[PDB]
Ligand binder design. Structure first.
Ligand SMILES: Nc1ncnc2c1ncn2[C@@H]1O[C@H](COP(=O)(O)OP(=O)(O)O)[C@@H](O)[C@H]1O
Ligand SMILES: Nc1ncnc2c1ncn2[C@@H]1O[C@H](COP(=O)(O)OP(=O)(O)O)[C@@H](O)[C@H]1O
Ligand SMILES: [K+]
Ligand SMILES: [Mg+2]
Lengths: 524, 114
C-alpha cells in the first residue's frame, strides 16, 4: 500500500518515544523492590507478572513510527530470555541508556558509524574484563544464594533448588510443574522411568497399591507388533523352566496374546507383565536400544535379521525389581557392564553437541539423565491460580540462574560488576574523536542498572552511585536492607553469563538503532 | 545562613518527630520534606544536581553550605550569604497556614463562566 516516509530528527524522536514507552513499562520491575505489571488477556483472567520479557512481548503502540521503535528494542529482551533465561530487564535498561546517550551525541554533529564502532570496542573490552573478574560457583551455599537472589529473595526456593541439584547430579534434569497443596515439594526419581503402564489390569498381584511388582525378572525387548501368541512359545517355555518372572516391552500386544498371558499369570504358570514401548518413531527405537544397554539384552527386530521365535535367554535382559503402575514403569538396579553405559552416554553427548533445536537437545538431555543421572520434579504450591503462575515463573528464573552460575561462575550483583568494569576501562581510546565519544557513551550507560535499582527503592540514585564508585572491590549497596557492604559476603550473587549476555545484546541492538536516518512505514 | 540551608538544618534535626496517628505521621513527613525545596530549586536553577549538593550540605554541620554564584562549598557566613531569621520564619509559617486552609476546604462558590 501507500507509505509514509520520515527523515532525520523527526524519525529519531518518534523512535525514541516508542523506545521510552516500552522501557518505562519494563523498568518498574527491576530489583528487590520492583513491582508487578498486570497484563490483560483476551481469553481468561489478567496475569500479574514481574518478568521483563513477559511485559515486553505485549507492548504495541498505536502510532506506527513509535511502534517501530518499540518493536526494535523488544528483540533485546527476547534474545536475552532465549540465551540465558534471565537478565532481560537489565538488558532493556542498558539498551535504553545507550540509545539515549547515542542520540544526544548524534544531535551534536557526530558520525553515527564511528560512535557505533566505539561502542563495539568498549563492549568487547568490557566482556574480557568481566571474564577476568569472575570466580567459580561450585559449593551448595553459593548455589543456594544464587537461587535465592533470582527468586526475589525467597530462601525456600534457593534451598529446594540446591537440594535438587545435589541429589540429581551434574547430568540430571529438573523441571517445574503445578502442585496441589500450599507448600513446595520435591520428588526425585532414580533409575529409568517411562510413561507406559500395564496393558491389562488383571496382571496386578498387589491390589493394596494397585501395582505390579516383579523381582529379578527378564526383559524381552520386542521391536515389533505382536498379535499372535505362536511367536512367543519358545521364550515363554524357557522362562517357565527358569522359574522367574518375565516382562514384555513391545510395540503393542493384541487381544489374543494378551488373553493368553493373563490366563497364564493367574494359573501360576508364569509371571508375565506387558507394557508398551515408549515414544513414537526413531526415538522409540533409540530408547528400546537404551533399555537394552542398561539391562544387558538384545533388541529383537526384523530390520537386523533376527526373529522372535529364535530368541533365547541370552537376548533377554535382567533387572533387580520392576514396578508397574497405571501410568509409569520403573526398572531398578538393572544388570549392565558400565563401559556400555559410558559409551552410550558419550555418543549421546556427541549428537547433543550437533543439535540445533532446543527441543531435540532437551530430549537428548532427558535420555542422558535416564541412563546415567536422575530426574527431579519440583511442584509449586499456591492458594489460587494467579499466585501459582507468578510463583512458578519465579522458580523457573531461579533454576535457569543456578544453571548459568554453575556453568560460568558468579560476579558481585546489584549492578556493581558493571561499575567496576567501566572503572577499569577508563583509559580506552579509539581512532578518532567520534569513536572516543562512543566509548564514553558505553561506559556511562554501564551504570544504568544500579541507578534504576536505587530509584525503585525510593532513594537517590546519584548519591548511591557516587558512594559505590568511590569504593573498591565487592563494595556495594544492599537495596533490601539499605546499607553498604560486601556484595559477596551478604550473598548478592549474579552469574557472569547473564551480565555478559545482557551487555552484548543491548549493545548490538542499540548501536544499529543509533545509525538511523529514514523510516518508511504504512499510512494511518 | 542563606541559600536555604537553615531549613535543611532544622529538617535534619527534626527527623525523629512522631505523631499520635498514622495520618499525623504522614503530615509530619510532608512538612519536613518541604524544607529542602528552596535549596533544591536554587541548585536546579544554577544547573547542578540537587541531590548530590543537598546530601553534601546535610552531611556538614553549622553554617556549611553551597555558594551558587561561584559553585563552591564553604562556610556561608564567611562567604557573606545571610538571611534574617524573620524572613525564613515568616515564609515557613505563611506557607503552612495556606496549606492548612486548602487541606480543610470543602466547597468553592464562583460565578458561572458566562
Ligand atoms: N538485595 C539486593 N540488593 C541490591 N541488588 C540486588 C538485590 N537483589 C537483587 N539485586 C539485583 O537486582 C537485579 C535483579 O533484577 P531482576 O528483577 O531479576 O531483573 P532481570 O530480569 O534483569 O534479572 C540483579 O541484577 C541483582 O544483582
Ligand atoms: N550566592 C548565593 N548562593 C546561594 N544562595 C543564595 C546566594 N544569594 C542568595 N541566595 C539565596 O537565594 C534566595 C533569594 O531568592 P530570591 O529570588 O530573592 O527569592 P525571594 O524574593 O523569595 O527572597 C535567598 O534565600 C538567599 O539565601
Ligand atoms: K524484572
Ligand atoms: Mg532474574
Amino acid at each position: 500500500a501507500a507509505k509514509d516516509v520520515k527523515f532525520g530528527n523527526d524519525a529519531r524522536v518518534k523512535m525514541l518515544r516508542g523506545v521510552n514507552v516500552l522501557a518505562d513499562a519494563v523498568k518498574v520491575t527491576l530489583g528487590p523492590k520492583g513491582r508487578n505489571v498486570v497484563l490483560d488477556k483476551s481469553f481468561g483472567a489478567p496475569t500479574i507478572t514481574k518478568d521483563g520479557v513477559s511485559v515486553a512481548r505485549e507492548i504495541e503502540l498505536e502510532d506506527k513510527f513509535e511502534n517501530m521503535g518499540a518493536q526494535m528494542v523488544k528483540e533485546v529482551a527476547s534474545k536475552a530470555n532465549d540465551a540465558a533465561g534471565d537478565g532481560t530487564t537489565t538488558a532493556t535498561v542498558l539498551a535504553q541508556a545507550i540509545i539515549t546517550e547515542g542520540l544526544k551525541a548524534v544531535a551534536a554533529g557526530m558520525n553515527p558509524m564511528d560512535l557505533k564502532r566505539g561502542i563495539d570496542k568498549a563492549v568487547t573490552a568490557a566482556v574480557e574484563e568481566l571474564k577476568a573478574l569472575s570466580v567459580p560457583c561450585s559449593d551448595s551455599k553459593a548455589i543456594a544464594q544464587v537461587g535465592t537472589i533470582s527468586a526475589n529473595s525467597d530462601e525456600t526456593v534457593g534451598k529446594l533448588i540446591a537440594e535438587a541439584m545435589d541429589k540429581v547430579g551434574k547430568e540430571g534434569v529438573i523441571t517445574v510443574e503445578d502442585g496441589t497443596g500450599l507448600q513446595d515439594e520435591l520428588d526425585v526419581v532414580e533409575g529409568m522411568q517411562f510413561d507406559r503402564g500395564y496393558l491389562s489390569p488383571y496382571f496386578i498381584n498387589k491390589p493394596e497399591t494397585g501395582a505390579v511388582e516383579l523381582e529379578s525378572p527378564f526383559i524381552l525387548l520386542a521391536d515389533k507388533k505382536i498379535s499372535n501368541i505362536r511367536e512367543m512359545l519358545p521364550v515363554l517355555e524357557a522362562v517357565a523352566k527358569a522359574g522367574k518372572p518375565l516382562l514384555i516391552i513391545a510395540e503393542d500386544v493384541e487381544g489374543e496374546a494378551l488373553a493368553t498371558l493373563v490366563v497364564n499369570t493367574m494359573r501360576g504358570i508364569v509371571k508375565v507383565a506387558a507394557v508398551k514401548a515408549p515414544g513414537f518413531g526413531d526415538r522409540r527405537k533409540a530408547m528400546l536400544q537404551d533399555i537394552a544397554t542398561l539391562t544387558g539384552g538384545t533388541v529383537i527386530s526384523e530390520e537386523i535379521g533376527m526373529e522372535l521365535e529364535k530368541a533365547t535367554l541370552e537376548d533377554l535382559g535382567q533387572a533387580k525389581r520392576v514396578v508397574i503402575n497405571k501410568d509409569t514403569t520403573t526398572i531398578i538396579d538393572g544388570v549392565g557392564e558400565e563401559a556400555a553405559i559410558q559409551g552410550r552416554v558419550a555418543q549421546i553427548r556427541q549428537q547433543i553437541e550437533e543439535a540445533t533445536s532446543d527441543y531435540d537437545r532437551e530430549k537428548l538431555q532427558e535420555r542422558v539423565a535416564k541412563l546415567a543421572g536422575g530426574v527431579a520434579v519440583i511442584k509449586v504450591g499456591a492458594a489460587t491460580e494467579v499466585e501459582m503462575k507468578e510463583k512458578k515463573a519465579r522458580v523457573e528464573d531461579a533454576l535457569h540462574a543456578t544453571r548459568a552460575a554453575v556453568e560460568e561462575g558468579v560476579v558481585a550483583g546489584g549492578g556493581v560488576a558493571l561499575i567496576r568494569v567501566a572503572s577499569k576501562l577508563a583509559d580506552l581510546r579509539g581512532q578518532n574523536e567520534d569513536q572516543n565519544v562512543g566509548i564514553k557513551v558505553a561506559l556511562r550507560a554501564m551504570e544504568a542498572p544500579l541507578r534504576q535499582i536505587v530509584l525503585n527503592c525510593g532513594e537517590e540514585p546519584s548519591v548511591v552511585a557516587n558512594t559505590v564508585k568511590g569504593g573498591d572491590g565487592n563494595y556495594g549497596y544492599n537495596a533490601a536492607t539499605e546499607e553498604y557492604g560486601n556484595m559477596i559476603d551478604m550473598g548478592i550473587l549474579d552469574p557472569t553469563k547473564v551480565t555478559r549476555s545482557a551487555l552484548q545484546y543491548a549493545a548490538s541492538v542499540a548501536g544499529l538503532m543509533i545509525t538511523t536516518e529514514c523510516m518508511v512505514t504504512d499510512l494511518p | 545562613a542563606g541559600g536555604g540551608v537553615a531549613l535543611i538544618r532544622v529538617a535534619s534535626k527534626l527527623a525523629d518527630l512522631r505523631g499520635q496517628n498514622e495520618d499525623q505521621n504522614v503530615g509530619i513527613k510532608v512538612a519536613l520534606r518541604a524544607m529542602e525545596a528552596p535549596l533544591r530549586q536554587i541548585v536546579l536553577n544554577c544547573g547542578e544536581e540537587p541531590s548530590v549538593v543537598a546530601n553534601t550540605v546535610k552531611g556538614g554541620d553549622g553554617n556549611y553550605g553551597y555558594n551558587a554564584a561561584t559553585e563552591e562549598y564553604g562556610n556561608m557566613i564567611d562567604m557573606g550569604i545571610l538571611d534574617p531569621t524573620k524572613v525564613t520564619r515568616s515564609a515557613l509559617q505563611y506557607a503552612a497556614s495556606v496549606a492548612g486552609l486548602m487541606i480543610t476546604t470543602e466547597c468553592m462558590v464562583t460565578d458561572l463562566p458566562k
